[PDB]
Every structure is written in C-alpha cells, then in structure tokens.
Design a protein around this ligand. Structure first.
Ligand SMILES: [Zn+2]
Ligand SMILES: [Zn+2]
Length: 515
C-alpha cells in the first residue's frame, strides 16, 4: 500500500438469508430490493473514490418453501447478481447432501469459505480457508469460519468423513498462515458462530466474542457474523439491544479491538461498516444497519425499489416453487384430525404426526406443542405441501431442549395444567401419565418412568419455548437450541419420507389422561 495514503473501504454484510430470495407478503426485504440498495451504495462509494466488499455470514439454505424445494438455487444466483464477494459456510449449508453444497458452490460466483471444516481421513480442509481481494493497491484477506456445533446439533445426517474443528483455534492458525505468506493489509473474518452478550455462549459452542478475546488484540479489522440471528447493536457494554428498531442507530460490538457485527437474518438489513485504512491502521468511521423495506404496515426508512433484473432472474424460481406446492408429497390412509374442537380437547393423530416429525428432526425423546398451533386437518388421500402449510401456516420454528429428569417432571407438570377447550391445551408425544390434583402420576417418557438423574431431549416450537401460551420458558436455559427449521418443512419432509402413511401408527391410546 502507499505510505501516508488513506483508503476508504466500505464493508457491506448480510447473514442467515435462509431462503428469503423473494420479498415477503408485506413487501419487505427480498434480493431485488437488496440489489437496488447495494448497487446504490457501490455508486456512492465509487464516486467518493472508495472500495466496497460485500460479505455473507452464511446460512443461505433452508427456511422458505420456494427456495428449499430448489435447493436455494434462486438465492445463490440472486447473490451473484447482488454481487457478493464471499460467504462463510453456515451450519445449514449441511442440511442437504454434500453433492448439493458442491452444486451451490458451482452456482456461486463468489467463494464459499471455511477454514475449520476438515475431511477426517486426510486431515485436509474441505473448502478454502480464505479469499484475497485487491482493492486499490490493498490486499484484503477474508477468512471463513463455521460453528463446530454444526454436526452435533439435532439429528445429524450428512457428515460422512467430515469434522468441524474449533473456530477460534483455527482462526489463530489461519491469521498466522496469512501473515507469513500473504501479509494481507487487512484481515476480516466472515463467521457463522454467533454473538453472545459478553461471550456468554452457555451450552452453545464458543462464538465471536470469545474468539475475538482469544485472538491478538486488533488482529482482525472485524468479524462479520451470523448464526445466532441478531442485529448486533449494543445498548450497553457487552449487552445487545433487545428489540432493536429498524432505522435507529446501531453501535456494533468491539471486543479486544475487533469489531463484531451481525445483520440479523433473512435479508432484513444490509450492514454497512465504513472504514479508513492508512499506514496499517484500520479505523471504523461509521456503522449502520440499513433496513431493506422493513415495515412495522408502514416503512421505517425510504422505500427501496426492486431491481427489475433481479425480478426477472428470480420470478421463474418463485413461480416454479409456488406451483410445486400443489404436488403430492405423500398420502395417508385415514383423516389426520387437526380440527380445533378436537386438538384443544384431546390428543389427536395429527398432533402425534407433527410431534413425531419434530422429534425425528431434532433427535428428541418426547415433544409437546399447543393444540392451538394445529390449524387444519388433512383428509384421507394425497397430501401436498399446500395441505401441510394450512395445518402449519405460521412459520413457528422447531427447537429442542436437553433437560434433567427433574426438569422434565417440573416442565410436564406445569404444561399438564393447561385446560382443555383452550389453545394452550397440550399435544404430547412419547409422554404418558394420569394427572390427579395438579400432580402427574406414573409419569413415563417412552414407556419408562422418568429418572431425575437422566437427560432427556424435548422438541417443541419457539412459540412455546419462549413462553407462548403460558408454557415454562426454555429459551433462556442452558441446553436450548433453536434449529432454524420451520414447522411446515419439518412436517412436509417427514410425511414425504414416511409415505404412504399408516395413520393407525399415530393414534393416541390413552397415554395421558386427566381426572
Ligand atoms: Zn441461521
Ligand atoms: Zn446457523
């Protein structure tokens, strides 16, 4: 770089896109509006003589039927047109077989990076640890890191000959490899690790804050994060704002001299970190989260028109995905009861089917949900995704919690207090008991009495886990995991691999009763 030269570098970033290539029902977000915004900032910065780098914290896959059904092809192609420079590989990039991820890599014109994912048998990295970019005469290195909880979470399916090594330890090695071989002027890490207040990751794998603290002070200009899905805007030292409001100031976190940022999820924001580099020092001059047509429905900020080129590119995928919703995914030999006056009074086969799908996705031992969360029945016969979405129309997310036998007792006793004839009435799976005077007698999980000294995994929805319907909160306790899997997708996928469904398998036989 030139001595005494001041370079202006703008780093734009997004993360946890999760299939949101299209605008939602309220005209919010989508990649067509993102394109207009990013093109605009590039024009602005080009005119100021600066440089732009657009990075993704990963998790492009999974979360919207039209995307999921096409293996996120529209999302990666859309990202090509928005012009991403690089992306960190996220844990959801492994929801599909490696063949699909390699296909996504072929689609993407930008590198999919990760320094810590290794092939077990050879000890060699599966992907590139970093990408180098020339901007003016600066050499900028972007390293990628992926959470090492990836293969440990839920019910893992595709990690044949693959392992995830500790991200923070790999970052130390990678930074040193780069300094000794490339001597980049600036190093930024795109990570899919999570931002936890004051590094309080709990049962989750250590994330961005603990890593920044472990690295040499200021060794990275910034960590462009993801996974935890939060707009990282600080209210107080080591404390993220709760209920951050679109369009308001956003102070990114700074730990051990390293800036840590995150733009929430689904293309809701494009983070913009404006830096000035001169004689080796990287100074953040400005930071903001720029909403992409977010609404409270009224806009918070100026409406961003959807780029026509993006709409023409994405429309066929949107249309094809919508039409695919009509297609038969399975069949049932009997009506699956989801009617309100049944699911709010007694255990039903639809409740058992949904919970069976959730336990299967999460590796859970038992599960529960509110009868009020089942919104329709499915008649005997063919089943389409469209049928599934009417049963599960609200996009609740499947989550699980590992708990002690004692906690299970306390948890189920509390939930059993929810009365029939209310949306809060519970649908259970793999739970049996007779409730008498607020007490649960002969309590069993999978036919075995509960052992206070054992650990059990329970599946449910985020709605319930965070206290919905008066259920005990699980989200703020260790062992909690929000999987990011949407209720409808989990049910559709389970029905699809399980069909033809013999519904007698899901018929309640009095496992739980009240008297
Ligand atoms: Zn995610
Ligand atoms: Zn993730």
């Amino acid at each position: 770089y030139e001595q005494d030269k001041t370079y202006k570098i703008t780093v734009l970033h997004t993360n946890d896109h999760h299939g949101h290539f299209w605008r939602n029902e309220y005209g919010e977000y989508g990649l067509a509006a993102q394109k207009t915004l990013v093109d605009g900032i590039r024009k602005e910065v080009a005119a100021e003589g600066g440089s732009v780098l657009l990075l993704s914290g990963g998790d492009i896959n999974t979360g919207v039927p039209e995307s999921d059904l096409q293996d996120a092809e529209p999302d990666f192609r859309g990202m090509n047109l928005v012009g991403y420079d690089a992306m960190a590989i996220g844990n959801h990039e492994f929801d599909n077989p490696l063949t699909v991820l390699r296909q996504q890599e072929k689609w993407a014109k930008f590198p999919l990076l990760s320094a810590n994912i290794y092939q077990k048998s050879t000890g060699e990295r599966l992907f590139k640890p970093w990408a180098l970019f020339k901007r003016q005469d600066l050499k900028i290195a972007v390293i990628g890191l992926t959470t090492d909880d990836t293969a440990k979470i839920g019910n893992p399916e595709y990690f044949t000959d693959i392992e995830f090594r500790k991200p923070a330890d790999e970052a130390k090695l990678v930074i040193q490899e780069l300094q000794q071989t490339e001597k980049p002027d600036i190093i930024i890490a795109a990570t899919h690790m999570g931002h936890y207040d004051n590094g309080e990751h709990g049962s989750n794998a250590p994330g961005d804050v603990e890593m920044a603290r472990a690295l040499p002070a200021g060794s990275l200009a910034m960590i462009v994060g993801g996974h935890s899905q939060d707009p990282v805007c600080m209210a107080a030292e080591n404390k993220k704002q709760v209920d951050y409001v679109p369009g308001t100031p956003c102070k990114p976190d700074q730990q051990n001299g390293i800036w840590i940022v995150q733009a929430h999820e689904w293309g809701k924001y494009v983070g913009r970190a404006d830096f000035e580099f001169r004689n080796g020092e990287m100074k953040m001059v400005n930071y903001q989260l720029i909403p992409v047509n977010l609404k409270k429905r009224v806009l918070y900020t100026p409406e961003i028109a959807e780029n026509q080129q993006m709409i023409s590119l994405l429309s066929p995928f949107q249309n094809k995905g919508k039409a695919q919703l009509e297609v038969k995914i399975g069949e049932t030999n009997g009506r699956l009861e989801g009617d309100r006056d049944k699911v709010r009074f007694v255990q039903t086969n639809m409740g058992r089917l949904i919970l069976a799908a959730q336990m299967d996705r999460t590796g859970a031992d038992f599960a529960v949900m509110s009868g009020g969360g089942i919104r329709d029945s499915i008649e005997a016969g063919d089943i389409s995704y469209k049928n599934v979405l009417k049963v599960q129309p609200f996009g609740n997310v499947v989550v699980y919690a590992d708990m002690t036998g004692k906690e299970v007792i306390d948890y189920l006793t509390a939930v059993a207090q929810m009365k029939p004839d209310s949306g809060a009435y519970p649908q259970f799976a793999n739970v049996s008991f007779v409730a008498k005077d607020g007490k649960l007698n002969d309590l069993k999980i999978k036919g075995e009495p509960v052992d206070p000294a054992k650990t059990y995994r329970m599946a449910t929805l985020n709605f319930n886990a965070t206290g919905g319907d008066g259920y005990p909160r699980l989200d703020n306790k260790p062992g909690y995991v929000n999987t990011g899997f949407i209720d409808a997708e989990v049910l559709k996928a389970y029905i699809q691999k399980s069909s033809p469904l013999d519904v007698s398998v899901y018929e309640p036989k009095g496992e739980v009763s009240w008297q």
